[PDB]
Design a protein around this ligand. Structure first.
Ligand code: GTP
Ligand code: GTP
Ligand code: GDP
Ligand code: GDP
Lengths: 429, 426, 95, 426, 429
């Protein structure tokens, strides 16, 4: 029934604090834990008057988890559930996975085994990491790694924030992301992806603001995510379990990575304008300028979409708005796939931050999907890697951290067959 | 006589709430209350769907099978939800994955024994059992897989009592799921070989029939369900009422199935007029046959006009002339001699109850066994191959302990089923 | 085209029952890392206190001649017996 | 007729409080008060368990034997605790060590004479004595040892009056002690050779039957005890009521014991439904036999379905048709011809009281003599050997003046007892 | 019914003052003796206002017993019952047992014969000593010695604080502990053991505090002990007499030493957090990081456990929580033992110091047991001994105190068969 969550890496933690915020916000549970089953699949009723968090937090520098235990919400989690390794983060996979990151893992696991026990027939762990980091790429790599073995019998949906197409940060980023992909690939169930840059566009083009603090992108994913777990694990006219996803969403064992998209992104101050039609939002979903991912459907044929709706929506409206789409053709779906549209309908409309910059409509569409499109995104990220590896660039930083020419070269070959995979499962009939 | 409803899956379940929402009122049974029946006739035959315990608590004798708690916990936490004895709820808190294989071989196979258990507690209730009603959708786990199992077991336990199946065959235009043809082809397979009366409904054949035959602009699911439940009430329950010429599941079965496949029908209700205005009352009778026998108005997706009929059963229920009934049916059989198959001198099976749908003056359920439904299993069967060929989302099945020969089997079977049905269209 | 061989379908029976038609379970490398893990789940699924002392500690052959220690010994559509301490009573398992 | 209860040990004692808690209310006897009896029938036969002194003080005629003060000083310092005449309390302030040997040969052997003394004061009470009720646990000192002695003496003093024994045989899964099989094997030995009716209850057969047959989530001991005491009331006291067809300890004995071992039974109560909801009232009768004869619901650990029956005694107590009773019993005897042994044309002993359990409409105590209980003494006997072999905590016995041949004796005896019981399962 | 107690050695006296504190604290008897049978098995209703203790205190330096007759509680005991030998303590067995300790014994006994008479059918003497001391090892050795003969017909449960595995104090410690074991072995009924160091861990890991004063460890044992006598000798739903223990707890005459463990050890300040489940505490009992003894179940198969519960507990909850355990297997119980679980249920929940650092739950589990584990602890403590004896080290300190090469060498051989004993009764089937 439930779904634990492990927010790994400063980022996965910032995004975590965010997604975690939106939560209580739409569940009437003040930062003090108290509200005045349903949603029990994400919150344990420690008694008692409180709620607490049904997740954990893993960063190797204290800085970021520290800030959580300062700002209201400080009261929300258990002093315990926020894991730290005073040591060093290191923007390098190796160190975070092998060398350092190792020391903490046990302890980490312990919670996802201590928190996994306390519950009642769970469904999986929504993992939150930032592909191109040290604690986010490496660590998790083995966290998800140690999970796939300790609970192979569950769902492993990892929600990632993969490398901005041109606006990356770390100098090595690809090293860290070609490595988190190959190690997690054979361990995840469904990997959701939200592109940091391609989200900015949305903040520039669909909300207008050249002042987007990280604290915003987080509010956004913090939204799209709320549409995944939160509301879905919440009763409705067309419920969709976590398993449901991976089933209706992955055509093949590769921990396939769909893309997250939201429909109503419109800025407060617009807040009064006449609302958008069920048809418009539906249509907005097929626009490559509103998908939290720089993977513009440049050719990538969709192969399965899970249209999660929430708010006031008439099933016919959908079983029509989608019909219209199924026949737009310029939206070309894979061949071997007749119908690939999982319509998920929830009741409770979205819930926008009291005064951030999100419109606040009475219905939204968080559609996610597997698109032969990422054939690109992976490509462009793989190429990166080579260029540097081709010269070993910052290689001495990993080797000296318990890695080898193996893990790199052998994780490169890995993704290679991910460029062929995402190519074969499509483009051909 | 008697029957024991079966709410397999969510859909089949969601509908349960509507089938029982209705039926009850068509039998004066309030939530937990008793028989408030405006009349005294809505009681002499109730047994068919309830049981005597208290003296005001006639509890629906159905089964609620589902591997997703939230669902039954929405049906049990709403309106009439508190009438079913908890014993009826055979849940499977497991992961109700959308896999036919996950609810037929791996996950459902466990919850089965704890179901059959009850399906026996209810069967061995009392008097004499007739058959079981089965609701579900052939486009999911708990529906096509686990419900299609429930029957394969039922039909081994009482190959005597009948088995009506109400299936929500995967609507064309848009599929409310992705593997749909997988979960479907696999369940139809099980159907063509266990239940002996299937009434296939299409969420979009309904919309249409519900947005143009009922100017209804916002046809919520509740509605569709409601319309459907309206037909299944005319069928069963109805005939368990008096009538100049009454029939019952068997008559319906023994007059509608020329060849053992089991064959699937397509239900159609009579007075289907928009609220206020339309309330034309043009219901003398030629108006009902006018209705029932038109293309649109067939809960099925396919259009009768696209293939002969083998049998038809106008199960009317409202005081009328065995003459203006028996007569009309004829002209109808002659104006359309074209499509009505010939090797059956009188395809039509006129049935006639007395008391009508509570608030109406005259209605008539239509249960057609037309060869037109060929053009649907075709559809389904197509979708399969186009995706089977590439084993699309097959790993979710096999990885659940399935077989590459299992899918082959079903398609073929159900695919042949298309073939045969044509053997009569010609 | 990756290499694979799916799991293994077996019919597990509890030694000394001659009544319960055992329970079917699936076994692979992705589900159970070892026999101990399988046995762990087996205890829960076969959990009892009449035919199995502590539920399920070991898995024996349909005849009970030898107990399986490695998953590699489990073949598809196989028949196994659950043991812990009690001896084999040889019953109409597959009969 | 009459009987004189015996609360051996703590358990047997703790239960005394529950057996008397009940029984009294089933006889309108308040703490020290008299007969408030809602009726007038709960008095004409009380004698069976009380004595006339004052005129409002009918004192329970039982014995409270225990070598641990605190216990009886908890039963005597609580609710109904102040109804027993102090003379009844035969305490042994000694060290009530958990050794069968410490309460049967060394410590208990002393306190015995001061017990028999009273067991005679009560027997020679008045009218005619029938037998004695004995409660205890076969997993401790004051229970298995000292209580098992109390009987060996009783059965020498009146080899005429009967001896029902209510033993709390060591539950499987988890034992509430360590030497358990030692204290047990040793007491069963004494049982198979003195008492002639034993009703074996299992703290975990109860939990189960109390946590799933009574959605009861926190089954305190008081409960278990309470459930048990519910059965022992249906047995005795009950039959000492009128009935179309009434029986009494002997009938029960003379219809249930084919072979002198004494044989042990397994009691089962009838209406065992959870409070609010479940209050289904499905108690016409087929519902009671449905109950009583299922696996779960047998206070024993073993499951009947695992071995034929020799005798059965449905001691019903609530107005019913000697037809729907005598009848049901039959089908039951034919649906399960498999397990019910054949060399007894009518295994079942139908008994029928009239007045039911105070607040209920219809109940029926079940006393089964099935060969299934073979698979329990086996258990016990196993545990012994596995530990005897190494003389585990044997020094606590021998060091108390015991014998290495004593343990041998018991095991064998009780071990053979397993053997025999199979002689009929075949 | 009662159980006298003889707190021997400064430590046994400090721990004594502690265990003695917790007492009145949960019996409403202010330090003035007055409260405004039940518990009479530990307190005599002397005069017509007071509650004079039911024990004695034996130290050869005044310092420690002196402090008792300064700090409130000063009023609690009888000026008499606190025995002292102004002379010298000496961290050496010999001197304390033979030479000096001898002089006092008579007098000592006198009280445990004067206090043993005054009562009504007692059950035994809960002895409190510190294995590796002078007054604690030696003295008692002959105290328990002189008891086993004067009251062989009772219970002799000695509650010891055996040598920290690596953090010992005295330089000789082992000499003093291999000697208190061999001399008491043939005299005790059941010897409870609480490891001083392994308790610190609990103060570091399960309560968090690097500031643990001896006064704390004492509050702890002061707790686990309260669960033994206090509450148990106190009415309940499943009473357990002292005899009960030794019976259900010792498989063999060796004064077998079980280990004390407590369940709810959580620090105040945590005091508000939602309480722990009956299942969790039960489970906490099978964790080698919560047992007041550095004898981590490294292999030691339990052979009998006496789960003493107190507070709000449903017998089924137990007769289930234990069932779950009986089938964890990784908790392997001895062979020759089918079921070795003595479930002791009390009513009154625990009673935490007003403001120490103990959580204060409404239910706890003081489980003690005999584990083939101590095969270790004894081993590691025996070896110690040899090393020094091998060179006579501080031998001249005992010899010159009325001992001989005999008592050492012959007490070494003693324990030797305690390393074989604790080995044979287990590890084999
Ligand atoms: N959406 C979003 N992206 C973020 C956030 N914080 C960081 N990122 C992105 O995630 C990556 C940064 O990872 P880092 O913060 O360097 O590292 P980490 O993954 O936390 O772990 P370490 O390298 O060991 O410190 C960059 O691509 C950032 O653009 C955030 O709050 N929201
Ligand atoms: N838990 C606990 N352990 C203590 C306490 N006081 C001392 N100990 C331990 O007990 C041992 C100390 O014994 P000592 O105080 O040297 O000696 P003694 O046993 O009182 O007797 P003498 O040697 O004659 O003074 C060491 O192992 C200490 O760690 C206390 O208050 N609590
Ligand atoms: N008429 C109708 N169709 C429904 C309802 N619910 C789901 N469906 C249809 O059922 C299919 C989905 O299967 P679903 O019922 O979710 O499967 P399951 O719940 O896993 O057994 C889609 O084709 C839906 O249109 C309903 O309440 N009424
Ligand atoms: N049903 C039940 N069992 C009990 C009660 N008390 C102890 N037992 C059981 O009795 C056994 C222990 O023996 P005990 O009664 O303490 O022996 P004694 O007191 O020394 O004679 C365990 O198996 C317990 O489960 C009780 O009040 N009810």
């Amino acid at each position: 029934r439930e779904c634990i969550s492990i927010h790994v890496g400063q980022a996965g933690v910032q995004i975590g604090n965010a997604c975690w915020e939106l939560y209580c916000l739409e569940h009437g549970i003040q930062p003090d834990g108290q509200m005045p089953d349903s949603f029990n699949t994400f919150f344990s009723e420690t008694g008692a008057g409180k709620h607490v968090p049904r997740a954990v937090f893993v960063d190797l520098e204290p800085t970021v988890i520290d800030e959580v235990r300062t700002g209201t919400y400080r009261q929300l989690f258990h002093p315990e559930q926020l894991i730290t390794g005073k040591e060093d983060a290191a923007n390098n996979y190796a160190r975070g996975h092998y060398t350092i990151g190792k020391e903490i893992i046990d302890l980490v696991l312990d919670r996802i085994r201590k928190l996994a026990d306390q519950c009642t027939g769970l469904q999986g762990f929504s993992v939150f990491h930032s592909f191109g980091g040290g604690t986010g790429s490496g660590f998790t790599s083995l966290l998800m790694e140690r999970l796939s073995v300790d609970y192979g019998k569950k769902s492993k949906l990892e929600f990632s924030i993969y490398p901005a197409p041109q606006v990356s940060t770390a100098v090595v980023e690809p090293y860290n992301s070609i490595l988190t992909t190959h190690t997690t690939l054979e361990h995840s169930d469904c990997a959701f992806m939200v592109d940091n840059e391609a989200i900015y566009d949305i903040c520039r083009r669909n909300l207008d603001i050249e002042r987007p603090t990280y604290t915003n992108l987080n509010r956004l994913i913090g939204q799209i995510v709320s549409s995944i777990t939160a509301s879905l694990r919440f009763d409705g006219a067309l419920n969709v379990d976590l398993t449901e996803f991976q089933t209706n969403l992955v055509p093949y064992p590769r921990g396939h990575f769909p893309l997250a998209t939201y429909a109503p992104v419109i800025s407060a101050e617009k807040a009064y304008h006449e609302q958008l039609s069920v048809a418009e939002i539906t249509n907005a979903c097929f626009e490559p300028a509103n998908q939290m991912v720089k993977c513009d459907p440049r050719h990538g044929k969709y192969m399965a979409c899970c249209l999660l709706y929430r708010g006031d929506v008439v099933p016919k409206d959908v079983n029509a708005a989608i019909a219209t789409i199924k026949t737009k053709r310029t939206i070309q779906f894979v061949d071997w796939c007749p119908t690939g549209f999982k319509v998920g309908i929830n009741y409770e409309p979205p819930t926008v931050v009291p005064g951030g910059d999100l419109a606040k409509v009475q219905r939204a569409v968080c559609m996610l999907s597997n698109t032969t499109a990422i054939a690109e995104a992976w490509a462009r990220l793989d190429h990166k890697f080579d260029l540097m590896y081709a010269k070993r660039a910052f290689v001495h930083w990993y080797v000296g951290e318990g890695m080898e020419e193996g893990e790199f070269s052998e994780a490169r070959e890995d993704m290679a067959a991910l460029e062929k995979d995402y190519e074969e499962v499509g483009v051909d009939s | 006589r008697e029957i024991v409803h079966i709410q397999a899956g969510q859909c089949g379940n969601q509908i349960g709430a509507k089938f029982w929402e209705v039926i009850s009122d068509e039998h004066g049974i309030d939530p937990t209350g008793s028989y408030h029946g405006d009349s005294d006739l809505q009681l002499e035959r109730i047994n068919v769907y309830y049981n005597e315990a208290a003296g005001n608590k006639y509890v629906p004798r159905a089964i609620l099978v589902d591997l997703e708690p939230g669902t039954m916990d929405s049906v049990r936490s709403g309106p009439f939800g508190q009438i079913f004895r908890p014993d009826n709820f055979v849940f499977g808190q497991s992961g109700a994955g959308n896999n036919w294989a996950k609810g037929h071989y791996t996950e459902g196979a466990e919850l089965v024994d704890s179901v059959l258990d009850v399906v026996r507690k209810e069967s061995e209730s009392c008097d004499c059992l007739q058959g079981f009603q089965l609701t579900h959708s052939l486009g999911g786990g708990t529906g096509s897989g686990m419900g299609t199992l429930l029957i394969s077991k039922i039909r081994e336990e009482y190959p005597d009592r009948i088995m009506n199946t109400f299936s929500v065959v995967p609507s064309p235009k848009v599929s409310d799921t992705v593997v749909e043809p997988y979960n479907a082809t696999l369940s139809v397979h099980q159907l063509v070989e266990n239940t002996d009366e299937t009434y296939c409904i299409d969420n979009e054949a309904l919309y249409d029939i519900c947005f143009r035959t009922l100017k209804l602009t916002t046809p919520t699911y509740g509605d569709l369900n409601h319309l459907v439940s309206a037909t299944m009430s005319g069928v069963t329950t109805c005939l368990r009422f008096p009538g100049q010429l009454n029939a019952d599941l068997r008559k319906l079965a023994v007059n509608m199935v020329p060849f053992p496949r089991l064959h699937f029908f397509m239900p159609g209700f009579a007075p289907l007029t928009s609220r206020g205005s339309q309330q034309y009352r043009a219901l003398t009778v030629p108006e009902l046959t006018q209705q029932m026998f038109d293309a649109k108005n067939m809960m099925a997706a396919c259009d009768p006009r696209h293939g002969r009929y083998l049998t038809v059963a106008a199960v009317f229920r409202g005081r009328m002339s065995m003459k203006e009934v028996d007569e009309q049916m004829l002209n109808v059989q002659n104006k359309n001699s074209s499509y009505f198959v010939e090797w059956i001198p009188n395809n039509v099976k006129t049935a006639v109850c007395d008391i009508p749908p509570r608030g109406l003056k005259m209605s008539a359920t239509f249960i057609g066994n037309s060869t037109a439904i060929q053009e649907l299993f075709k559809r389904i069967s197509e979708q399969f191959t186009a995706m089977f060929r590439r084993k699309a989302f097959l790993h979710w099945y096999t990885g659940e302990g399935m077989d590459e020969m299992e899918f082959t089997e079903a398609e073929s079977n159900m695919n042949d089923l298309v073939s045969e049905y044509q053997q009569y269209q010609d | 085209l990756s290499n694979e061989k799916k799991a293994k379908k077996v019919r597990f029976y509890r030694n000394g029952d001659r009544y319960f038609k055992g329970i079917v379970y699936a076994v692979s490398s992705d589900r159970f890392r070892s026999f101990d893990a399988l046995l762990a789940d087996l205890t829960r699924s076969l959990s009892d206190n009449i035919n199995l002392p502590q539920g399920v500690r070991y898995i024996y052959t349909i005849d009970g001649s030898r107990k399986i220690g490695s998953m590699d010994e489990l073949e598809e559509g196989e028949s196994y017996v659950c043991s812990s301490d009690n001896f084999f009573k040889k019953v109409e398992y597959t009969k």
